[PDB]
Amino acid sequence: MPREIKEVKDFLNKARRSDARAVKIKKNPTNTKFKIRCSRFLYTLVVQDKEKADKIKQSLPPGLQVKEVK
Amino acid sequence: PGRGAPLAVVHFRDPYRYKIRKELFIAPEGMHTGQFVYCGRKATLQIGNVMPLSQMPEGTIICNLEEKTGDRGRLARTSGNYATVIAHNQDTKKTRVKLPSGAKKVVPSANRAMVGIVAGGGRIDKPILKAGRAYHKYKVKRNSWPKVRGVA
Amino acid sequence: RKIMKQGKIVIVLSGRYAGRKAIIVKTHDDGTPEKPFGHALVAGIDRYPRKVTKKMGKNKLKKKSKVKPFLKSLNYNHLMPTRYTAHDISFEKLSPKDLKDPVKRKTHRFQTRVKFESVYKEGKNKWFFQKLRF
Amino acid sequence: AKRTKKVGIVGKYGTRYGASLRKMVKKMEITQHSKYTCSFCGKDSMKRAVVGIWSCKRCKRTVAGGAWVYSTTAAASVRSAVRRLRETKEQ
Amino acid sequence: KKPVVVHSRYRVRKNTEARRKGRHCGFGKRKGTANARMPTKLLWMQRQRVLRRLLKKYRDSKKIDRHLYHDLYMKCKGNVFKNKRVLMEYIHKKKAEKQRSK
Amino acid sequence: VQRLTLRRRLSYNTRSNKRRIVRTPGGRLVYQYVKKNPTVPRCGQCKEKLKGITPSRPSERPRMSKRLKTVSRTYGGVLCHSCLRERIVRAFLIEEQKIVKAL
RNA sequence: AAAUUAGAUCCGUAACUUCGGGAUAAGGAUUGGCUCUGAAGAUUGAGAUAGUCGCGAUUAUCAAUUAACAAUCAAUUCAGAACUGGCACGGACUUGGGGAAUCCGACUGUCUAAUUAAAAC
RNA sequence: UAAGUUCAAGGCGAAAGCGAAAAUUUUCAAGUAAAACAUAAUUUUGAACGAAAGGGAAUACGGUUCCAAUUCCGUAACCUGUUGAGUAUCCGUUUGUUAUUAAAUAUGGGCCUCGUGCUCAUCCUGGCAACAGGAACGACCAUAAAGAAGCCGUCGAGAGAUAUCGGAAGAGUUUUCUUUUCUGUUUUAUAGCCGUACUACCAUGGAAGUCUUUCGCAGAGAGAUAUGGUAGAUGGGCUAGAAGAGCAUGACAUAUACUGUUGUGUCGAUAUUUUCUCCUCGGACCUUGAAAAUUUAUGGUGGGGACACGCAAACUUCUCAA
């Protein structure tokens, strides 16, 4: 997967897209990944702090689909 | 390959078209990359200019001589071989040259030759020593064989 | 006697301006410790003018006859000097070493155009504004 | 040390071909594989690519030479002879 | 899925361990030539590297200078030195023979 | 070890099945096919490689940027910087001999 | 036909010779197991001397090291010795008999697929 | 495209057809955001076939079947073509602001009530350089390069494999011994990063008391050593893919009752002259080791665009989308 946004706002910029159909949220033991699914590519935002990770689980577009993987 | 004399790639400009002509020559010995070649009637006598056989002095050693005029280089063009301007006959315009056979032929005097011996001489003094090295000689030439004798 | 003096038209020999012609504005003969080698600040031409014939009228005329310069401090080993000296370029008064700031590389390189074309007509330094197929 | 008393470069053909043709080819087998001093920049770097063509590793000049020797003696007697006809016929 | 057959490396590990102590390395146990068992070209190449990285260690520490370095570099190819200890011996006395004379 | 098989129907060893052994996330030991070696352009007379240009391959260069194929100066991806000034001074001292031979 | 020799280490090696050779000439010695011993490397070397503040943490350096500088670490090969058994030890296997000449062809090469591989080509 | 082949009317032959290879052939072939007292510049070897091993755009993993998988499924990419969108030109004046400025790759000039008056100006920048960055005049000519290459060797690098030693999790032997013996202990393509093997280069500077250097020689007043830079991200490590994914080893739980789950997946260091690649540097040769489509860079004359008081742009060599 050829992309990864190391910045917060340029990940959320890739949420309000005509594509960007889904955010497949994974919660790892040390961080949460926010893997947003545009046409090609998919785009991971690794956030480590475990608490604004839920502040960026909100402030997403509403109709954007969100998975939460098990 | 096959030809034991080196060749030289010379780049002239075209006088009527707008490109660069790329001529293969047969190398005068001493020709080197980056040097100038002058071809024409008013060529100075130096290796390897090519100029008509009337603008030469007598005894001048030449190679790549035209048999008939304009026919682009037909005589003394193997490795180590040359022709010699014997003597003009000033009008009737027929130079006599001496050819690598020993034979002495009369050319015209408007045809061209390049000054100098040809490079790559003299190949033929090394023994081949080796049937497999004559194999290699001839596999870039033709099927003159291991020539089995007819008496066999 | 000393060459690479002030008004001498040099030839750039290295780096994004190779082949261009250049006057010299100010010479540092013995190496200011930032660039301690022998160098000089030049003022040359990036984009040459183009020829005008009599048939092209007025704004095809002014379009072929612009000049784009440059301003570059260069080594003495990356220059080739000529016999030719620019003469009526006489107002290099305020261009010493203030081309570190970016906006005054543009209030000056524009101000080398107000003189590199005032000497284009009238035609002086005719070898300077020729392309010279290097 | 010295490894061969007499053959030199033709011990590689060793006991092959007869002593005269080994002796004969050795003269040519030394001058080819020699490094001649380059007559364009001065270094001992004028080696032979193919038969008749010699080139220099620095300065990048290829010349047209002899089969084994860089310049033959039959061709330097032509470069002399041509310029003493050039001295007469020019001026 | 029927477990794999045990293939034990116990026996070979025991004889590699004996043959650090030199247990089966004699003239009845040698089948390659001494060049095939240990290549002289590899042997002389590691020696020539041991010596050359010693001499760059001494020259660039500050110890010897260029003129002794090159004289020993050329002597190192040769057989004046077989180890790095005899080269360290030789350096240790041509600095004794030198600063005495200097 | 896990021995390998070829995944293309070219079973011979030419210059266009260049392959490398890979381990995959299933612990697999599979073959990956290598394409051909990218090279840089040469100087117009040195026959020495140029610098400032990425090593490219003749189909890849449409899908490369401009500045990935150029240096930035005159004769950029064509000649060395040294062969360039060998021409700038030669194109000047010859065209200045042709004024002192005219006057 | 078969047997003999055969690995490796060491010593030694004639007639002739196109000085390359012949030559692995010939001729001999050594060889297992077990306990040690020697030699052949790499990488950081290793830093000695107030005490502010409370030896502790913020806390020094030109060089001389040196003649095994000291530990770590790394592979493997080669020489030596002592003891030790049915001399069985290159313990299987892998693996040359040698020499004195005569004739022919110089050599490596090629040939009669299915009777001739040669001195024939 | 090769070696070559089939045909094309010069021809020839009673013809078949040359077990021709035609190279035949008045303009036999091209060219035009297409012209003027010929529209006007140019080229003839026609043509096609001939490589499932040469050249040549783009993909990998995990899963799945009674039978197919680089093809299905899931997942993550990529190429080609055609459209669309975003995005190299958001000024000094004067709005927020008395000038100082702020919106702002962003002016200068001269005077003028200052100027809003007048006038000038944007086909990009940086570095001494080697060269660099997200883009920053493919419309033809010209030149150069890539494609593009043999055989024997080779220092170095990485990969794969094998082997050592530790840790976690199982297994095998146990009369006796054996901190034992074994097994597995994984990370694709694609891509963002940082670095390196070695090589070339650049700046400084000027070398004999010659020095740098290789296993080897090789190199230097045609510029060595030295110190600092550039390039080749050769070939590797971090991150993304990677959903304690997936996978594999393994502890339970749940009957076919149409399934959930806890843990592991960690260190170090060998030598692979014997594998594959990458880089270097050589040698033998009266033997010098393919061609074309395809592709790019540059250069050239014209011609195209662009104007500040701001509206823009961009077959746009940039980013994305359909």
From TrEMBL, chain C:
The keyword Signal does not apply. Residues 3-30 form the KOW domain. SMART domains: KOW. GO terms for cellular component: cytosolic large ribosomal subunit; cytosolic ribosome. The keyword Translocase does not apply. Keywords: Ribonucleoprotein, Ribosomal protein. Pfam families: KOW (PF00467), Ribosomal_L27e (PF01777). GO terms for molecular function: structural constituent of ribosome. GO terms for biological process: cytoplasmic translation. Belongs to the eukaryotic ribosomal protein eL27 family. This is 60S ribosomal protein L27. It comes from Drosophila melanogaster. The lineage of its organism: Eukaryota, Metazoa, Ecdysozoa, Arthropoda, Hexapoda.
UniProtKB/TrEMBL annotation, chain F:
The keyword Translocase does not apply. One of its GO terms (molecular function) is structural constituent of ribosome. Disulfide bonds join 43-80, 80-83. One of its GO terms (cellular component) is cytosolic large ribosomal subunit. One of its GO terms (biological process) is cytoplasmic translation. Signal peptide: none annotated. Keywords: Ribonucleoprotein, Ribosomal protein. Belongs to the eukaryotic ribosomal protein eL34 family. This is Large ribosomal subunit protein eL34. The lineage of its organism: Eukaryota, Metazoa, Ecdysozoa, Arthropoda, Hexapoda. The chain holds residues 2 to 104 of 168 of the full protein.
